[PDB]
Design a binder for this molecule. Structure first.
Ligand SMILES: CCCCCC/C=C/CCCCCCCC(=O)O[C@H](COC(=O)CCCCCCCCCCC/C=C/CCCCCCCC)COP(=O)(O)OCC[N+](C)(C)C
Ligand SMILES: CCCCCC/C=C/CCCCCCCC(=O)O[C@H](COC(=O)CCCCCCCCCCC/C=C\CCCCCCCC)COP(=O)(O)OCC[N+](C)(C)C
Ligand SMILES: CCCCCC/C=C\CCCCCCCC(=O)O[C@H](COC(=O)CCCCCCCCCCC/C=C/CCCCCCCC)COP(=O)(O)OCC[N+](C)(C)C
Ligand SMILES: CCCCCC/C=C\CCCCCCCC(=O)O[C@H](COC(=O)CCCCCCCCCCC/C=C\CCCCCCCC)COP(=O)(O)OCC[N+](C)(C)C
Ligand SMILES: CCCCCC/C=C\CCCCCCCC(=O)O[C@H](COC(=O)CCCCCCCCCCC/C=C\CCCCCCCC)COP(=O)(O)OCC[N+](C)(C)C
Ligand SMILES: CCCCCC/C=C\CCCCCCCC(=O)O[C@H](COC(=O)CCCCCCCCCCC/C=C\CCCCCCCC)COP(=O)(O)OCC[N+](C)(C)C
Ligand SMILES: CCCCCC/C=C\CCCCCCCC(=O)O[C@H](COC(=O)CCCCCCCCCCC/C=C\CCCCCCCC)COP(=O)(O)OCC[N+](C)(C)C
Ligand code: NA
Ligand code: NA
Ligand code: NA
Length: 629
């Protein structure tokens, strides 16, 4: 009487008259609605989803009857429970459907008959957008009701009688509800609004219950707490909210991270918590994550909030500034040594060993100190291979460029050291590149000043955004004219001249003359020994006009558009450069020394478990407003 296609129509039509009678029919033939040959073959869908998906106007009275029929078959447990085994819906239930439809009335229902509030909606649809999915919310009904802007459900699901989803439950990634609100928060007004509300709500609510470990401390299956998870994913609205979190009510004051130490008229101190932000070695920290492992698109807005700017500046005072200016002179000196050993390197004979002299032994100190730097920069970069390397480090203006060139410098000293010992006399040519490359690595050390460091950033952008597109065209013209102009010179199959005849080097030198010529550095000085002399002169003039008057002076113009556009952007990169410099120094210290330079002051912010105080390191920031008396 009721086949598979029969019912899915009836319930999809949502009219509880045509279905009546399937109750006694099914009871007789020894069936239960969940049975295989009554539910869809592809997904695994049954009557109850199809009712809810095709819900209309907010209600549909088929469902209380199909559920009334459920206990008659005795499948309520199995009936409001089902893994759609579709590889796009691996775990969706009627409760996942009840909530996303904003259908409060049935969400109260479906849980009341004791269904589930923990089903892991693990389907590829229900994965993050980078796994090839559409909507991650966690994987749970409570994590959904939060992530779908439904406060009423979320309140209910907790303080509902029958069953309740604890606010602690982890999905199949470790991520709880707060982890999941960080996964769906974009940095828009409307999104950041209702994320922060519910984030607080559950966090303040979960303090009432389980008056123990904060739910914000629940690490997921890669550690990263909701704050650490926002810092890695670039979510300012939640990230900013968490740090300057000042709750006042006596119970939930351990949840605040911005205190009110003292005030006196229009001057107001304040005291931020650095529990996660600054952890010298013995914990993961937000600040390491931002400066190294995060979204580069907004990392400057992350390092420009409440302690983070003044916490790095404080490290710069203590050790950051000093140790950086030992690194520079240590490097500038090492390049003096690599210079003097090159100006006193001999130039006659296969390997110029024959030292046996106070000078040549002094040169020997030079090459050895050099090779020490090359093997150093080689290992420190390959240490970074098993450590901080493998982002897209080929064109970043945040030390991605120099990691290569110090590696090139490192390789290129090793090869010269290999050939100076393997007899080969091109130790020199390979060294010469290493030397020019090495001084051009001292631009790394312009990072300790906005003045010189912003400048060095504009050099490299202009080198990318402005100079390559210029050489593409410039080259393209040059082979065009040069070939065109070589064609108009008589061979030396004629009288052995270059300045009248052409043979075997005439192309190559023109490329240099036509290079000197556009640079404003060579003279025409018409060759004039040509079959057609007047066509020749007409072409060089078109080369000057196009390449000097028009391309190279347009190149100045384009730079002016570049430096105007990338000035601010270069100020913001430098702040990432500068911060990266500080932590590269800090990480290079032992832990006890990092704790000696520990930034902030220990404070009893308040009282906690059995009167135990809160010994939270914090960072004072005095402030003035002549407005909020
Ligand atoms: C977008 C426009 C592109 C223009 C491209 C240039 C075009 C030129 C078109 C005309 C072709 C001329 C052909 C010359 C042929 C040639 O060479 O014939 C010769 C000798 O010479 C003549 O007989 C011509 C005498 C007249 C001279 C005055 C020219 C006035 C030119 C005015 C216009 C200048 C444009 C200037 C550049 C402006 C560019 C601005 C935009 C920027 C983008 C490019 C071969 O001698 P032969 O007897 O075989 O043997 C040698 C014996 N002997 C003669 C030396 C005793
Ligand atoms: C407002 C405050 C104003 C104060 C301003 C003046 C401050 C001056 C501080 C100067 C000291 C810091 C610089 C030292 C040199 C340094 O650290 O050089 C670093 C590395 O060094 C080392 O590896 C050597 C290890 C030993 C260092 C400490 C020795 C000095 C100890 C004295 C500290 C003074 C305080 C306490 C006492 C210590 C005892 C325990 C506490 C007791 C209670 C107080 C250079 O960087 P590098 O790794 O090359 O850069 C990155 C390299 N990479 C990874 C990219 C390849
Ligand atoms: C990932 C990097 C690794 C590099 C790979 C290259 C390594 C090794 C190759 C070297 C060996 C090849 C020659 C072996 C045979 C030989 O010795 O051949 C010689 C001549 O050979 C050469 O001259 C080879 C050219 C060397 C330079 C290569 C490029 C070096 C690296 C280039 C990159 C660095 C630049 C940067 C530019 C700066 C601007 C950037 C700004 C960027 C700003 C952002 C024959 O002459 P002969 O007198 O007979 O020699 C004596 C022989 N006898 C008689 C004793 C047996
Ligand atoms: C191999 C042996 C080498 C022996 C050591 C030789 C070098 C020692 C370094 C001496 C300086 C370190 C202490 C600085 C403390 C301090 O006050 O640092 C800073 C201020 O100063 C600096 O930024 C360094 C000023 C420029 C140095 C010139 C180059 C020196 C090397 C050549 C405190 O932050 P702030 O004022 O917020 O920084 C903002 C920077 N702004 C606006 C004030 C300039
Ligand atoms: C308050 C002051 C206290 C002073 C304490 C002095 C303590 C110790 C002195 C020795 C310091 C050595 C520290 C080296 C730290 C280091 O690792 O340095 C490296 C730099 O490469 C080296 O060092 C090469 C190695 C060979 C030794 C140096 C040359 C030979 C010895 C010279 C020492 C004596 C100097 C100068 C003497 C004349 C001074 C005139 C003052 C005048 C003041 C105005 C830091 O590069 P990195 O950050 O890792 O960046 C790499 C790039 N990447 C990967 C991050 C992109
Ligand atoms: C390459 C490695 C890394 C290098 C980094 C350090 C480089 C240089 C050190 C310079 C430090 C001082 C500059 C601070 C400027 C500043 O902080 O602000 C600048 C203001 O600049 C100036 O007014 C003029 C600047 C030029 C002064 C010249 C004297 C210093 C050099 C020493 C003398 C050299 C001669 C001769 C030597 C003797 C020879 C005898 C042997 C001869 C052979 C026998 C911009 O301010 P603003 O517009 O607010 O922009 C924002 C920047 N802000 C404040 C946030 C950082
Ligand atoms: C994608 C296609 C790439 C194809 C590349 C094919 C490469 C080579 C083919 C040539 C093979 C022969 C060369 C042997 C080398 C040699 O030794 O040749 C010499 C010839 O003399 C020279 O001085 C060398 C002149 C070289 C000509 C280059 C032409 C133009 C090449 C253009 C390549 C660039 C493309 C594009 C630029 C894009 C720009 C925008 C960005 C777009 C990005 C996609 C042999 O001397 P010999 O005969 O013994 O004596 C001299 C002659 N005499 C006296 C007997 C009459
Ligand atoms: Na000129
Ligand atoms: Na000249
Ligand atoms: Na001249």
């Amino acid at each position: 009487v009721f086949n598979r296609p029969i019912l899915f129509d009836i319930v999809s039509r949502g009219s509880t008259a045509d279905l009546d009678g399937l109750l006694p029919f099914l009871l007789t033939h020894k069936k239960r609605l969940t049975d295989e040959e009554f539910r869809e073959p592809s997904t695994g869908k049954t009557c109850l989803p199809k009712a809810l998906l095709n819900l209309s106007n907010g209600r549909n009275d088929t469902i209380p009857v199909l559920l009334d029929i459920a206990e008659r078959t005795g499948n309520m447990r199995e009936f409001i429970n089902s893994p759609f085994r579709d590889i796009y819906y691996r775990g969706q239930t009627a409760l996942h459907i009840a909530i996303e439809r904003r259908c409060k009335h049935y969400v109260e229902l479906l849980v009341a008959q004791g269904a589930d509030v923990h089903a892991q909606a693990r389907g590829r649809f229900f994965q993050p957008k980078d796994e090839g999915g559409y909507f991650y919310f966690g994987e749970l009904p409570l994590s959904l009701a939060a992530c779908t802007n439904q406060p009423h459900i979320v309140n209910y699901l907790t303080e509902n009688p029958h069953k309740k989803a604890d606010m602690r439950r982890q999905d199949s990634r470790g991520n709880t509800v707060l982890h999941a609100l960080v996964a769906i928060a974009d940095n828009t007004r409307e999104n950041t609004k209702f994320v922060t509300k519910m984030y607080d709500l559950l966090l303040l609510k979960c303090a009432r219950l389980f008056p123990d470990s904060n739910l914000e401390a629940v690490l997921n299956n890669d550690g990263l707490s909701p704050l650490m998870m926002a810092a890695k994913t670039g979510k300012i609205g939640i990230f900013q909210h968490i740090i300057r979190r000042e709750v006042t009510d006596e119970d939930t004051r351990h949840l605040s991270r911005k205190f009110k130490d003292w005030a006196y008229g229009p001057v107001y101190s304040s005291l931020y918590d650095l529990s996660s932000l600054d952890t010298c070695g013995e914990e993961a920290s937000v600040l390491e994550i931002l400066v190294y492992n995060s979204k580069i698109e907004n990392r400057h807005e992350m390092l420009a909030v409440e302690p983070i700017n003044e916490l790095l500046r404080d490290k710069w005072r203590k050790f950051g500034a000093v140790s950086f200016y030992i690194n520079v002179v240590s490097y500038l000196c090492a390049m003096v040594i690599f210079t003097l050993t090159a100006y006193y390197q001999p130039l006659e004979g296969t390997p110029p060993y024959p030292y046996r002299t106070t000078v040549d032994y002094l040169r020997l100190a030079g090459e050895v100190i050099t090779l020490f730097t090359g093997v150093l920069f080689f290992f420190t970069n390959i240490k970074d291979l098993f450590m901080k390397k493998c982002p897209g480090v080929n064109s970043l203006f945040i030390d991605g460029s120099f990691q290569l060139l110090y590696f090139i410098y490192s390789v290129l000293v090793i090869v010269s050291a290999a050939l100076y010992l393997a007899g080969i006399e091109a130790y020199l040519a390979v060294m010469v590149f290493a030397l020019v490359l090495g001084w051009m690595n001292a631009l790394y050390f312009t990072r300790g000043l906005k003045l010189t460091g912003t400048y060095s950033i504009m050099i490299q952008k202009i080198l990318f955004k402005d100079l390559f597109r210029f050489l593409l065209v410039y080259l393209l013209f040059m082979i065009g004219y040069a070939s065109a102009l070589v064609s108009l010179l008589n061979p030396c199959a004629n009288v052995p001249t270059y300045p009248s005849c052409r043979d075997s080097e005439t192309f190559s030198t023109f490329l240099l003359d036509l290079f000197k010529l556009t640079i404003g550095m060579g003279d025409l000085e018409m060759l004039s020994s040509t079959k057609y002399p007047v066509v020749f002169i007409i072409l060089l003039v078109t080369y000057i006009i196009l390449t000097f008057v028009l391309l190279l002076n347009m190149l100045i113009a384009l730079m002016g558009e570049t430096v105007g556009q990338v000035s601010k952007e270069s100020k913001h990169i430098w702040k990432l450069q500068w911060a990266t410099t500080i932590l590269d120094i800090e990480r290079s210290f032992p832990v006890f020394l990092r704790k000696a330079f520990r930034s902030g002051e220990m404070v009893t912010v308040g009282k906690s478990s059995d009167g135990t105080p809160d010994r939270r390191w914090c960072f004072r920031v005095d402030e003035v407003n002549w407005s909020h008396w």
